[PDB]
Design a protein around this ligand. Sequence first.
Ligand SMILES: Cc1cc2nc3c(=O)[nH]c(=O)nc-3n(C[C@H](O)[C@H](O)[C@H](O)COP(=O)(O)OP(=O)(O)OC[C@H]3O[C@@H](n4cnc5c(N)ncnc54)[C@H](O)[C@@H]3O)c2cc1C
Ligand SMILES: Cc1cc2nc3c(=O)[nH]c(=O)nc-3n(C[C@H](O)[C@H](O)[C@H](O)COP(=O)(O)OP(=O)(O)OC[C@H]3O[C@@H](n4cnc5c(N)ncnc54)[C@H](O)[C@@H]3O)c2cc1C
Ligand SMILES: Cc1cc2nc3c(=O)[nH]c(=O)nc-3n(C[C@H](O)[C@H](O)[C@H](O)COP(=O)(O)OP(=O)(O)OC[C@H]3O[C@@H](n4cnc5c(N)ncnc54)[C@H](O)[C@@H]3O)c2cc1C
Ligand SMILES: Cc1cc2nc3c(=O)[nH]c(=O)nc-3n(C[C@H](O)[C@H](O)[C@H](O)COP(=O)(O)OP(=O)(O)OC[C@H]3O[C@@H](n4cnc5c(N)ncnc54)[C@H](O)[C@@H]3O)c2cc1C
Ligand SMILES: Cc1cc2nc3c(=O)[nH]c(=O)nc-3n(C[C@H](O)[C@H](O)[C@H](O)COP(=O)(O)OP(=O)(O)OC[C@H]3O[C@@H](n4cnc5c(N)ncnc54)[C@H](O)[C@@H]3O)c2cc1C
Ligand SMILES: Cc1cc2nc3c(=O)[nH]c(=O)nc-3n(C[C@H](O)[C@H](O)[C@H](O)COP(=O)(O)OP(=O)(O)OC[C@H]3O[C@@H](n4cnc5c(N)ncnc54)[C@H](O)[C@@H]3O)c2cc1C
Lengths: 176, 176, 176, 176, 176, 176
Amino acid sequence: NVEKFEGAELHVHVTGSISAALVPWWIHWLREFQPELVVNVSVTPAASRFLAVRALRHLANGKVWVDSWDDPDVPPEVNSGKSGASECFLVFPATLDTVMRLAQGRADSPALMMLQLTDAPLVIADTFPGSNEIVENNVQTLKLRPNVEFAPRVEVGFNLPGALAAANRMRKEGRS
Amino acid sequence: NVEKFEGAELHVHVTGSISAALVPWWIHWLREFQPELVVNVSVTPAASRFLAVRALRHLANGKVWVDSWDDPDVPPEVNSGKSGASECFLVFPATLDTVMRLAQGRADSPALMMLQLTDAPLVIADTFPGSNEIVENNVQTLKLRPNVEFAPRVEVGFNLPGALAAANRMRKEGRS
Amino acid sequence: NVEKFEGAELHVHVTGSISAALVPWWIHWLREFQPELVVNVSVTPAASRFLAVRALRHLANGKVWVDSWDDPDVPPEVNSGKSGASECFLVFPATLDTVMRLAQGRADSPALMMLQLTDAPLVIADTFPGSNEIVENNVQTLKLRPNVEFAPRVEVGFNLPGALAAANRMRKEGRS
Amino acid sequence: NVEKFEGAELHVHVTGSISAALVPWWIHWLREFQPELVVNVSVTPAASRFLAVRALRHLANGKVWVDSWDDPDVPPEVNSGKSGASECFLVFPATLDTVMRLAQGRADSPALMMLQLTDAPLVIADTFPGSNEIVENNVQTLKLRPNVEFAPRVEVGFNLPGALAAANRMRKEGRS
Amino acid sequence: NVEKFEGAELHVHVTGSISAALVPWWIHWLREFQPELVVNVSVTPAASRFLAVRALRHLANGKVWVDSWDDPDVPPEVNSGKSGASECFLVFPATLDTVMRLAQGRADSPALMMLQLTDAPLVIADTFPGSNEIVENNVQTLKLRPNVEFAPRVEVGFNLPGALAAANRMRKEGRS
Amino acid sequence: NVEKFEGAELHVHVTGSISAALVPWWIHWLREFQPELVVNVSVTPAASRFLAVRALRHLANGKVWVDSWDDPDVPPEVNSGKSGASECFLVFPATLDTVMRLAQGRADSPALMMLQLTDAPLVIADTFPGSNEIVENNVQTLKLRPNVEFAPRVEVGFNLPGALAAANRMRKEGRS
Ligand SMILES: Cc1cc2nc3c(=O)[nH]c(=O)nc-3n(C[C@H](O)[C@H](O)[C@H](O)COP(=O)(O)OP(=O)(O)OC[C@H]3O[C@@H](n4cnc5c(N)ncnc54)[C@H](O)[C@@H]3O)c2cc1C
Ligand SMILES: Cc1cc2nc3c(=O)[nH]c(=O)nc-3n(C[C@H](O)[C@H](O)[C@H](O)COP(=O)(O)OP(=O)(O)OC[C@H]3O[C@@H](n4cnc5c(N)ncnc54)[C@H](O)[C@@H]3O)c2cc1C
Ligand SMILES: Cc1cc2nc3c(=O)[nH]c(=O)nc-3n(C[C@H](O)[C@H](O)[C@H](O)COP(=O)(O)OP(=O)(O)OC[C@H]3O[C@@H](n4cnc5c(N)ncnc54)[C@H](O)[C@@H]3O)c2cc1C
Ligand SMILES: Cc1cc2nc3c(=O)[nH]c(=O)nc-3n(C[C@H](O)[C@H](O)[C@H](O)COP(=O)(O)OP(=O)(O)OC[C@H]3O[C@@H](n4cnc5c(N)ncnc54)[C@H](O)[C@@H]3O)c2cc1C
Ligand SMILES: Cc1cc2nc3c(=O)[nH]c(=O)nc-3n(C[C@H](O)[C@H](O)[C@H](O)COP(=O)(O)OP(=O)(O)OC[C@H]3O[C@@H](n4cnc5c(N)ncnc54)[C@H](O)[C@@H]3O)c2cc1C
Ligand SMILES: Cc1cc2nc3c(=O)[nH]c(=O)nc-3n(C[C@H](O)[C@H](O)[C@H](O)COP(=O)(O)OP(=O)(O)OC[C@H]3O[C@@H](n4cnc5c(N)ncnc54)[C@H](O)[C@@H]3O)c2cc1C
């Protein structure tokens, strides 16, 4: 049930769960599955303790940068909600904290400024250890944004093929 | 009116108010008052400017760690809302900022992940310099969590004996 | 339509937008326009990448400090919502993130503790790259505080003369 | 055609090719495929530029160490050709240089001392960019050691399932 | 049986026993018990591993300095046996080593120069792990100095109320 | 009386007076006043204590570099008296020391090599604290160079509009 992303370029935002260690394998998979796709990647300091940014610079064909206002590779168009010509944004994986920061309008990292300002489909491949009533409320708050969805389950949302299908879906709804 | 904590182990989370300087005296008090109790302690970077973690490693009989995702002493069970076999969690003292972060579902430190995920009684010995309408709303938000209480007053909540009584109370309510 | 601030001392809190590079010119302007005024200045780490704190120590006649709990110049009265004898507080410029932190009751910097605790007129000279529904909600939340206003427009609020007029206005309303 | 390793514990030695970025995914796979297996892992400085040792400490249930005589995690039994109770050794992936060093009797890293001294099945999942006559001669030299094999092809030998089958094969030949 | 110190200012010299962790609580106690008293504090490098000098700068109303010839806060009057206008000197707590250094006329720290040169009452709140014949001889040697006493017991001398009573006693004997 | 610079590109050399703090405002002004103009900027180490080079990289559309032989951004054409295709050179502001170094043929910074070798109009927006007979002689020495002028006064020469008019003037004299 695995389908191709119908756009030309997407952006992957990688956050600090142990699943980030598995992302270079999935980026490699997506590059072989769809060689014409341009894949940009942002990586949080936390995630950079679980993978090597250097390896992504090799596996990914788009821009690769650490999600930090002091990193010189951070492209200027983050301040307009863009990543090159990315047509969707996948948070893969997405920590509890990254989702709380998104739900709260925070722009304390250039990737979060970018995710606050984008109108493009934004898919969240959540990897939460757990939840409570206050977390669930902050997740509900994200329905105020029409472009945001959580990826299809596999109880956890670490699901790139599902994220790609959800993205192609929200892309075609944005045209008709 | 001072009573013993009826569990076997608790956890003390120390945050960056000048009252943190007084916590080693209170930990020493609790160790003499109740020698069979296992006391775990987490200390925020801020609080570590007002006390010495080394002194707690001596005064406390449980695990002691700095509240930072890079500290190697951070136990893995924080990601399941546990601290060893702690049966309650005392934030002693609790800054305004720690309480805002808790009220907002933040997990940007392993102690906050832990406090988000625990079902055990969570008592907050607040030391706020002051308040406003937005702070009061964020404090109200904590009533969505049944396990959270503020410690009995002494206008400030820097009250370990009261916290222990409140904890034994919420522990027995959780059994009947 | 440019009028003088009718108080004796104010405080300028400078945050990390490229407009911070232009603040020393405006501080110099305010010092020549109103030589009797004492101007205190706080500068966020981010803003300190776009201007030099040293230059403000020369151009400003009040206290100048980096907005960090470890800076030794941070005056103790931030923990009572004061900056010397400042009678208003201008966030000039104000990032999206600084405004979200204010709207959320955060005290994770001494300037934010100060801005949470003050009753004085607080004017926000916002420089947002953009917005969404969740940001707009967090901006609405600031109406729970009677002393907070956004400066008059020039779509952006980087407007010191307007901020000064708004401040004198909220000052006289607080007396009658 | 994927079969389980018939021993209790093995050792994975990871070397500096971009394929090392994909090893945490394969370690995760082997841990789920065979939960009773103890997996030890050594990682060369070079490979540590393409993956995070920290992530392996989480994904692997055995000892994890950097292949350096100064790393304090290096177990003493490397000087007897052992890694805990490992019953085979997989070089996954194996650089040209690691294979030249092995072919030349080098012990300039504790993993290479270990691989020189072991009698256990040693499988080499080579990832060479290319070859020449002198490289091919050094690869032939490894036939002087009865326990050494190259993994089954998939032109490249980055093949853990094949390596496991080859290992179970050389293990049973060593008993009969 | 707790009485007030009858002078205007005293000096507390804190040394490297785990009891130093408890001194900020006792300084806080003395400041509330006797708000008019000016309390100066010196802290040895060793003691600074068990408490935070920063916390004492907040809790103490007099000068606070690290006991080191390179610390810029060290007041010049240590070279005349003074600490501001301190009328007594409490070594609280006092290590075995600090007492040996005092007994031997050592001035290898500015606090020890100060304690060698003072004529004011000097009270020693010893916290020794143990003793031998040579230690006891060095303690006897301190009777050659009329101003030196050990604080009343509670086997250990970690006793600020007793030290204060002993100090008021030796102060009035020095006048009649 | 404010006129546009009639060339396509100019270079601004910023030196270590407190007026350097005001240059980003003036660069912003010149970019809005004349959007087609390419503005290159060099900044002395001293001036970099009074402004942020990073802010100029954003406000200026040409090359921006620190005036140091070790800065990698220093363009090679400084050794031919050029800055890209700059048609004039404004020292804005100009310290006493920068003007002495220029008057004395010094090339101890790449900007000074550049200013020694250029034939283009060179305008000096001096900010001297004061003068003496030897300084005045060194300023007279600059009349040996036909391309050098001091900007029109406003007693001080911190005057970009005047500098631009003087530059267009010396440009047209160099053609007729
Ligand atoms: C082994 C392990 C597994 C984990 N698994 C999970 C998991 O499955 N799910 C999960 O939700 N969490 C997990 N965590 C916890 C997670 O790593 C933390 O919550 C972490 O803070 C997530 O950060 P991030 O990648 O979302 O963003 P980051 O950018 O790393 O966030 C760091 C924080 O610092 C702030 N910050 C901004 N600028 C700076 C700066 N200049 N310097 C410092 N801080 C700055 C950010 O605003 C943010 O609050 C795990 C942790 C460990 C150790
Ligand atoms: C003398 C004094 C007395 C004070 N008294 C009080 C008081 O009584 N009550 C009160 O409420 N406040 C008080 N404060 C202010 C208080 O210290 C600050 O609000 C402080 O930020 C509290 O931090 P914390 O201990 O709650 O948590 P911390 O963990 O110290 O929080 C630090 C912040 O950094 C973020 N962060 C996460 N990861 C990182 C990282 N890797 N690097 C950097 N930052 C990171 C955290 O999310 C958080 O926002 C006082 C301050 C001083 C100087
Ligand atoms: C060229 C450029 C232009 C920009 N223009 C704009 C603009 O116009 N508008 C806009 O809204 N944004 C803009 N930004 C983005 C802005 O700089 C960031 O959002 C930045 O985080 C703003 O920080 P601040 O000055 O508000 O506060 P800061 O104090 O700098 O906030 C830093 C973050 O770190 C946390 N923190 C607290 N203590 C510590 C500690 N000890 N160590 C580390 N972190 C800590 C704070 O809580 C906060 O979340 C721009 C960025 C760039 C590069
Ligand atoms: C993007 C990329 C992809 C690559 N892909 C491949 C590939 O597919 N196949 C391939 O064969 N190569 C590849 N290489 C090259 C490979 O990374 C180098 O050959 C590297 O030296 C391999 O080292 P190692 O991991 O085998 O062992 P290392 O232990 O990293 O070897 C480092 C060298 O230093 C010596 N040494 C020992 N002790 C020390 C010490 N204390 N300090 C310093 N040096 C010491 C070792 O003996 C050895 O000679 C690639 C390189 C890059 C950048
Ligand atoms: C957990 C723990 C508990 C302890 N409890 C006790 C206790 O209860 N009682 C007890 O007596 N001891 C105790 N000790 C031991 C005590 O900490 C040491 O004896 C320590 O040396 C005491 O130093 P001080 O604070 O007296 O003075 P310090 O000033 O710390 O003495 C350090 C030594 O270095 C010398 N020195 C001078 N200048 C310098 C310099 N620039 N650099 C380096 N050294 C210099 C000093 O002359 C002195 O000899 C304990 C130690 C630990 C770890
Ligand atoms: C608050 C303040 C205001 C001031 N206002 C004025 C003012 O209005 N007018 C005024 O004329 N002066 C003023 N000054 C003084 C001025 O900053 C100094 O004269 C300063 O040296 C000027 O340097 P520059 O920017 O001209 O060049 P710089 O390049 O900073 O000159 C530094 C010196 O170091 C030499 N040098 C070369 N290479 C190196 C190297 N690698 N490392 C170190 N040094 C090297 C240079 O040749 C030169 O002599 C002020 C100073 C302060 C603190």
